[PDB]
Each structure stands twice: as structure tokens, then as C-alpha cells.
Write a protein that binds this ligand. Structure first.
Ligand SMILES: [Cu+2]
Ligand SMILES: [Cu+2]
Ligand SMILES: [Cu+2]
Lengths: 112, 112, 112
């Protein structure tokens, strides 16, 4: 055990006119890829294992610079990423393949 | 330190054109519901209490599958969600009612 | 000083049409500013030091109400935010200058 489970999902949302519970919102359009969960918290020295399941219809990236993690998970595939969180801090979990405000970044927090 | 306070807010942002400090951006249109804060970090075994106030115009969801948390908070209503974080890991906090890239997910991190 | 490092980046994404790996995405338009990373996890009591480098084209905000943190970092400037997380909990890290769903909020988690 001990592995985290991060699922990468794509969302193509277009709602020209939202009308629910007496509330109306217009021209909603957002396309994003999300890491679920986005945040991983571990202790310094912890052996980290992240099972990344890419549910996006295309290749997705999973990078954490501080620990030399820069992976590309093929569409519909799963890749287990392992590394030792030998440095305390907050590190961005990001996709090197797509714009960060499309594929939203997450965070790897390594606490003392 | 007795419990967590999460406010669910809706943001209807429409900025056809904006120039600030000489920098221009055009056709900004984003409608989102955010959990504030999005991330909750607890220790394994903690009796978690999340006071969720829904300031969104419509009913909102708050789910954490790993702990059987699945709530619907009516607009303007505040609900206390209680569960024991009996499993360490990272668990997506999401809305089971709306598109995940509209109502952005958060994370419940349960550390050893 | 091994402190926290956060970079505030702006993304002006516009993709009317793009076909990648046989998948076509259309009408993508998102402008956001992100705190990278968005999540900071600390222990109640420790002296927090956050070095915020603002890579946004304009002045950016960094606020955490619970600890009276509220700064405005000029474009291209780096500012060190210092405070003591004297209260355990989850607190929203937000930009007090821009819309919450444009400059996405983060979280400061203070673990007891
Ligand atoms: Cu991506
Ligand atoms: Cu929702
Ligand atoms: Cu801002």
C-alpha cells in the first residue's frame, strides 16, 4: 500500500444558458483537465508512489520539478510515479504538455 | 482549530475587455463555484468537522468518496459535515451535482 | 532560509480550434493567474516564510485573512511574506485585487 491515486480527467463544458433553481447564468464555457486529487501531502523522507490514471482522451503530463518528476501518461493509461520526497516544501504538480490554466496545477506538500 | 470552515462561493465574471496598468486582456468569461478553502489537511484518526456554508445561488454538493461523504447544501444554508479520517491519503473533495471544471474540486489530505 | 517558494503566473489562453492525437478541442478561452504552488502546508506555531515571485504582468495580491496577511507584489517583483501560523485550520490564500475565479485561490493548511 501507501500509493496515492491521482486521476487525470478532462472536462469540456459548454452551457450557453444555465437555468436551474430560479438562477440563470449565460455563456458558460470552460475546458479543463484536472488532477483528482490535486494536492498530495507527505512527510519529508517519505517514499512517494502515485498511481496516475489518465482518463483524458490524450496524453497528459505529471511533473514535479523538485524531484525530477516529468512524466507523460498515455491517454487511457495508468503510470505509477515513484520518488522520495527528500526536500520539505510546497511543490507544484503540473502538466508540462498543456497550458496551466487549462490543465490546472496541483501541489505536492512535503512537511517536516 | 475545533473544525474547518468552508464557504462555497459562486463567481460570475464577465470582462469583455480590461486594461490594468497598461496590460490588456479581452473576452474573459468565467463562471465558477469554489470551495474556500479548497484543501483540508488532517491527521489519520482525526474526527473531522467541516462547517460548509453554501453562498452559491443554488444547491451545492460536497463529496469525499473515501469517507462516504456526500452532502447537498441548499443555497444560503450551512451544514456541518462530520466524519472520521480513518484512512491516510489524498481524497478529492468534489461537487456531485455540477461539472467539475465549473465547481472546482479540492482535496482532503489525511496524513499519518 | 528554506522557506516556501510561490510564483504567480498569468495565462492568456485562446484556442479556437486544435486537434491533438485525433482529438479536436474548440472555442477554448481562459485567462487566469495562478499561484504556483497554490497549497502551503505548515505546522501550527512554525514561522512561515513565503517568497512570492510575481511573474504576472500586473501587480498581484496575496492574502490570508486568518493571519492578517495581505500583500501587493508589483509585476516582476519578488516579496517575502512572513507570519506565524498561530492557529490550526485551513485558510484561503487569495488575491485581493482580482476576481477569485480568474486569479484562483489556494490554501494555507496549518496542521495541529
Ligand atoms: Cu495536461
Ligand atoms: Cu457544485
Ligand atoms: Cu490577482
Amino acid at each position: 500500500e501507501h500509493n496515492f491515486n491521482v486521476v487525470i480527467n478532462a472536462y469540456d463544458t459548454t452551457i450557453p444558458e444555465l437555468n436551474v433553481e430560479g438562477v440563470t447564468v449565460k455563456n458558460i464555457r470552460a475546458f479543463n483537465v484536472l488532477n483528482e486529487p490535486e494536492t498530495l501531502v507527505v512527510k519529508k523522507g517519505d517514499a512517494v508512489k502515485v498511481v496516475v490514471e489518465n482518463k483524458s482522451p490524450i496524453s497528459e503530463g505529471f511533473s514535479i520539478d523538485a524531484f525530477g518528476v516529468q512524466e507523460v501518461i498515455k491517454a487511457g493509461e495508468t503510470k505509477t510515479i515513484s520518488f522520495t520526497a527528500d526536500k520539505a516544501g510546497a511543490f507544484t504538480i503540473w502538466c508540462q504538455l498543456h497550458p496551466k490554466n487549462i490543465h490546472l496545477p496541483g501541489t505536492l506538500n512535503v512537511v517536516e
